[PDB]
Amino acid sequence: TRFHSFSFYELKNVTNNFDERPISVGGNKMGEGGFGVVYKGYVNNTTVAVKKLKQQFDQEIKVMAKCQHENLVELLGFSSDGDDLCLVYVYMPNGSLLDRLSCLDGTPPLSWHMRCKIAQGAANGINFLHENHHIHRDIKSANILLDEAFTAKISDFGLARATVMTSRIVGTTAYMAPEALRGEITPKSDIYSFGVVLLEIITGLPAVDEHREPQLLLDIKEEIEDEEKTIEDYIDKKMNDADSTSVEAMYSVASQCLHEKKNKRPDIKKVQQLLQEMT
Numbered sequence: 481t482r483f484h485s486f487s488f489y490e491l492k493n494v495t496n497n498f499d500e501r502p503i504s505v506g507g508n509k510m511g512e513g514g515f516g517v518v519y520k521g522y523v524n525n526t527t528v529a530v531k532k533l534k535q536q537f538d539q540e541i542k543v544m545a546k547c548q549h550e551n552l553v554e555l556l557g558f559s560s561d562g563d564d565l566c567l568v569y570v571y572m573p574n575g576s577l578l579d580r581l582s583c584l585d586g587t588p589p590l591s592w593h594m595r596c597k598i599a600q601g602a603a604n605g606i607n608f609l610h611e612n613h614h615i616h617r618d619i620k621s622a623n624i625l626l627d628e629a630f631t632a633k634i635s636d637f638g639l640a641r642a643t644v645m646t647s648r649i650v651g652t653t654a655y656m657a658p659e660a661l662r663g664e665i666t667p668k669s670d671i672y673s674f675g676v677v678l679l680e681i682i683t684g685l686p687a688v689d690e691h692r693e694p695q696l697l698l699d700i701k702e703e704i705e706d707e708e709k710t711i712e713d714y715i716d717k718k719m720n721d722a723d724s725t726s727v728e729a730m731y732s733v734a735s736q737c738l739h740e741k742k743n744k745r746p747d748i749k750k751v752q753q754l755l756q757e758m759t
Contacts, residue, residue: 601631
């Protein structure tokens with residue numbers, strides 16, 4: 481396939497022997513993604529992301545061959561020869577939306593203007609996936625990466641599938657649709673999850689917080705409906721460009737996305753339209 485074949489020993493070499501120490505401390509580890517660890521490598525004149533993990537390996541190189549879009553992380557290549565399997569991706573220097581919202585490591589808070597762009601970018605990514613009959617199954621802010629220009633790139637396609645039910649229920653609890661928690665498999669569940677993402681974008685809050693009432697961000701939608709609070713009271717304080725009307729428009733998209741009944745939710749195409757209007 482169109483992907484560059486890598487020697488395991490080159491990948492081992494360019495990652496400082498798969499240095500397990502985190503980046504912030506001088507090592508090469510960038511994260512752990514269930515099916516293995518992700519390392520920074522310096523190959524040629526290029527920083528890359530190497531996942532060091534067989535069945536669910538050849539699935540990815542299948543999906544990734546077909547699924548290339550401006551708002552999806554691109555696979556560059558792979559390693560099959562001896563010791564461990566490796567997947568190599570384009571490196572995203574601004575990390576995840578999760579971390580930028582939490583301003584992890586002292587990064588500056590994001591403007592409302594950039595947040596609108598990232599939201600649109602991510603809706604474009606999902607639309608492509610759905611257009612080509614793929615369900616992501618794990619849409620969340622930690623799986624939205626950001627490149628040099630803060631362009632949104634959807635990653636972690638491990639659980640991606642090319643309405644039926646399953647026994648192996650997967651996804652992240654705080655972002656999962658009611659039906660998806662019942663083993664149902666459907667794009668309508670990606671929308672529910674994107675809805676939680678928009679709530680994170682508006683409020684800068686984590687999807688779950690055990691010391692918080694409510695623990696689940698999605699439960700604020702009911703506090704607003706029961707007008708015991710308003711969206712205004714929830715808006716991230718760490719912005720200076722957030723006009724009330726556009727924020728309200730995004731909250732409306734989130735609200736619709738979070739319809740607990742799967743058929744009443746808008747599809748990704750409508751979500752896309754609504755986010756352009758907002759802008």
